A and B are shown apart, each in its own frame.
Chain A
Amino acid sequence: SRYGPEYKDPQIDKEYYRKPLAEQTEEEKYERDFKKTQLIKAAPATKTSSVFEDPVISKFTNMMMKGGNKVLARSLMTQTLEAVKRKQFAKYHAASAEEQATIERNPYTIFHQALKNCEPVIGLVPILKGGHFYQVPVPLADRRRRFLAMKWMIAECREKKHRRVLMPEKLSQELLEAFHNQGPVIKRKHDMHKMAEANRALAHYRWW
């Protein structure tokens, strides 16, 4: 809020500005954008025009960061991606042509898929009624769910590793185990789902 409410967020996408001539409503729209004499917030240091940056990877990076260390958290992320990569290159050359067609070597797609699998469907909110606190099944927003996934990943691979064991190691492990749905993270997701079925009657207490 060193920006007045007048200031719009910038659009960093290069593809949007490069190829305008085929869209009428969007031409009209960004015409109205700049021509409105509209002020623009200065593009943040984290975000780049880079063809290489995944906003999800960056979010995760941030949620991993303790104190002020981007350098250290970006290190750990980088190392983890490299570790998943090399773990799958190991699993590729000791395999046979069929499994060489099957196995995924893109660490990015592995990260994404492993998060999609770990995100909860349904959730729980405490509701006070008649002086008692019941836990009630609540549908969740998308953002809340992605958040729950990432936070659960990091909480586990911070908490449950042996102190000798480094972070990118444990994290690459859990990424690959959650890729295949057998990870402890996924067990947590299921504990939620089961607690949500156990209480399904109480779904009536929710007024919204």
Chain B
Amino acid sequence: TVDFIKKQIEEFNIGKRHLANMMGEDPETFTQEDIDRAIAYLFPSGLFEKRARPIMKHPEEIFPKQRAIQWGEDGRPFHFLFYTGKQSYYSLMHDTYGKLLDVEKHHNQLRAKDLLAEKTKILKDPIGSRWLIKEELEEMLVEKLSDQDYAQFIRLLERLSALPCGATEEDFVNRFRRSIPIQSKKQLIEPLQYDEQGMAFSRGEGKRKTAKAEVVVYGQGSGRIDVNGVDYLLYFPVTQDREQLMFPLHFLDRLGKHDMTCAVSGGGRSAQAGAVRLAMARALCSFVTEDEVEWMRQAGLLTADPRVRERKKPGQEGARRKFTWKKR
């Protein structure tokens, strides 16, 4: 299957030339990014599954990695672990264990010479370091693995890192590191805004359950709220909804200090109260301190409410409720 790969690369290069020609672009500065736009425009398949759509890519990415030939023309297998049936994995285990022994020897000589000169590199936790998944390892050896296998190996790396770390050792265990990406849930503060000689107004948009709400809050005003051009006592006759509107302000003790205008559409009364609630909350984050933002989040003020009406299902009554079931 090597001749295949060679040919496929030839024709991918010839093809990439052709494509670059019709799309009217420079064949040198053509990227994969550009190839994609070019196909997407030439063979426009709406299909929801992205793997089923037309693709022209470098055959190395398209085809799966291949185990190379395992023996010479005489029949002798190249690698001394061949007959284990997994050479890749047991080699890894072999060299890992070897490095462990090495560490033990060297550190014992340094125990007899009255030297512990090493340090514990085992805490990378601020880097957000983790081990490879089994999938990753399986991709790195070009070989299938077992859960207990992966487990064994990882446990061994652990044994390694728990001792004095050499340079080549640190470098060794760090192939098997990955870093988990950014973990911070801190919000993105809306830049405060100054409009037409008016000072300090902020915007926010809530969405709850078929109701949309856009709320503009002025820091410079006294306490009142105008929803769809009318007073909030008129628009929200029910106490419960007025209390919902009150929640975020009363939480920040801003209750007299701000002046708000709102546009709310769709849903019923309670849904609109909820919408304005969320939007108001999100708007008041510009005026407040970064710590109280975390507080509002921890009160559940800043999260949209995902709960929404479920679809009725055929052969049932209510999306859950079932037609009456007769035993006999």
Interface residues of A (CB under 8 A from B): 2-3, 10-12, 14, 17, 30, 33-34, 37-43, 45-46, 48-50, 70-71, 74
Given that A2-B306, A43-B247 are contacting pairs, would A49 and B299 also be in contact in the complex, using a CB cutoff of 8 Å? yes
Binds A, one of B84-92, B101-109, B238-246: B238-246
The A-contacting residues of B in range 225-250, CB under 8 angstroms, are 238-240, 243-244, 246-247, 250
Among the listed stretches B17-25, B167-175, B290-298, which one makes contact with chain A, having 4 or more residues with CB under 8 Å of it?
B290-298
Cβ of A49 and Cβ of B247 under 8 Å apart?
Answer: yes
Q: Cβ of A48: which chain B residues have Cβ within 8 Å of it?
A: 243-244, 246-247, 250
In the complex formed, the residue of B with least CB distance to A4 is B306
Q: Are A37 and B183 in contact (CB under 8 A)?
A: yes
Interface of B is mostly: helix
Once A12-B299, A34-B297, A34-B298 are accepted as A-B contacts, the answer to whether A50 and B304 lie under 8 Å apart by CB is no
Number of CB contacts from chain A to chain B under 8 A: 70
Minimum Cβ distance to chain A for residue B66 (Å):
40
Q: Which 10 A-B pairs have the closest CB atoms?
A: A10-B300, A43-B300, A42-B303, A42-B305, A2-B306, A37-B185, A17-B295, A49-B251, A42-B300, A48-B243
Q: Is A45 touching B307 in the complex (CB atoms < 8 A)?
A: no
Compute how far the CA of A50 lies from the CA of B308 in the bound complex, rounded to whole angstroms.
Answer: 26
Whether, in the assembled complex, B273 has its beta carbon less than 8 Å from a beta carbon of chain A, the answer is: yes
- Complex interface: chain B residues within 8 A of A39 (CB): 185, 303
**How far is B246's CA from A39's CA once the two chains are assembled, in angstroms?**
24
Asked whether B247 lies within 8 Å of A71 as measured between CB atoms, the reply is no
Question: Bound state CA distance, A200 and B199, in angstroms?
Answer: 75
List 12 additional contacts besides A42-B306, A74-B240; criterion CB under 8 Å: A2-B308, A10-B298, A11-B299, A17-B295, A34-B298, A37-B185, A40-B303, A41-B303, A43-B247, A48-B243, A49-B247, A50-B250
For residue B278, which residues in chain A have a CB less than 8 angstroms away from its CB? 42
Determine if B184 is an interface residue (Cβ-Cβ < 8 Å). yes
Which A residues are CB-close (under 8 A) to B300?
10, 12, 40-43
A40 vs B250: C-alpha distance when bound (angstroms):
20
Docked pose: A207 CA to B87 CA in angstroms? 59
Query: A34 near B185 (CB under 8 angstroms)?
Result: yes
Name, among B183, B243, B278, B299, the residue most crowded by chain A CB atoms within 10 Å (CB to CB): B299
Q: A34-B185, A37-B184, A37-B185 are in contact. Are A45 and B298 (CB under 8 A)?
A: no
Q: Is the interface of A mostly helix, strand, loop or mixed?
A: loop
Contact A45 B273 (CB under 8 A): yes
CB distance from A119 to the nearest CB of B (A): 28
Interchain nearest-CB distance for A49 vs B (Å): 5
Is B217 in the interface zone, CB < 8 Å from A? Answer: no
Measured CA separation A86–B169 after assembly (Å): 82
Pairs A–B under 8 Å by Cβ, sample size 12: A10-B298, A14-B251, A40-B300, A41-B303, A42-B278, A42-B300, A42-B306, A45-B240, A48-B246, A49-B246, A49-B251, A50-B250
Nearest A residue to B237 via CB reads A71
Chain A nearest CB, measured from B187 CB (Å): 11
- Establish whether residues B306 and A3, one from each chain, have CB atoms under 8 Å apart when the complex forms: yes
Instruction: Give chain A residues whose Cβ lies under 8 Å from the Cβ of B270.
Output: 45
Could you tell me which B residues sit within 8 Å of A by CB distance? 183-185, 238-240, 243-244, 246-247, 250-251, 270, 273-274, 278, 294-295, 297-301, 303-308
Nearest-neighbour CB distance to chain B for A148, whole angstroms, equals 27
Chain B residue with minimal CB distance to A13?
B299
**A40 in contact with B298 (CB, 8 Å):** yes
* A43-B280 Cα distance, complex, nearest whole Å: 14
Q: In the bound complex, what is the Cα–Cα distance between A12 and B296 (angstroms)?
A: 9
A residues in contact with B244, CB < 8 Å: 45, 48
CB-contact partner of B304 in A10, A42, A49, under 8 A: A42
Assembly CA distance A38 to B185 (angstroms)? 8
Nearest-neighbor residue (CB-CB) of A7 within chain B: B303
Q: A39 → chain B, closest Cβ, in Å?
A: 8
Q: How far is the CA of A11 from the CA of B297 in the complex (A)?
A: 10
A34-B185, A37-B185 known; A10 and B246 CB under 8 Å? Answer: no
- A50, B298: Cβ atoms closer than 8 Å: no
In the complex, the chain B residue whose C-beta lies closest to that of A17 is B295
| Interchain CB contact under 8 A, A50 and B238 | no
Which of chain B's residues have a CB closer than 8 A to the CB of A46?
A: 240
B299 and A10 contacting across the interface, CB-CB below 8 Å: yes
The smallest C-beta distance from B314 to any residue of chain A, in angstroms, reads 22
Name the distance in Å between A36's Cβ and chain B's nearest Cβ: 9
Closest Cβ–Cβ distance, residue B243 to chain A (whole Å): 5
Please tell me which one of the listed residues A3, A17, A49, A71 contacts residue B298 in the complex, with CB atoms under 8 A apart.
A17
**Which residues of B are found within 8 Å of A37, using beta-carbon distances?**
183-185
Nearest residue (CB) in A for B301 is A43
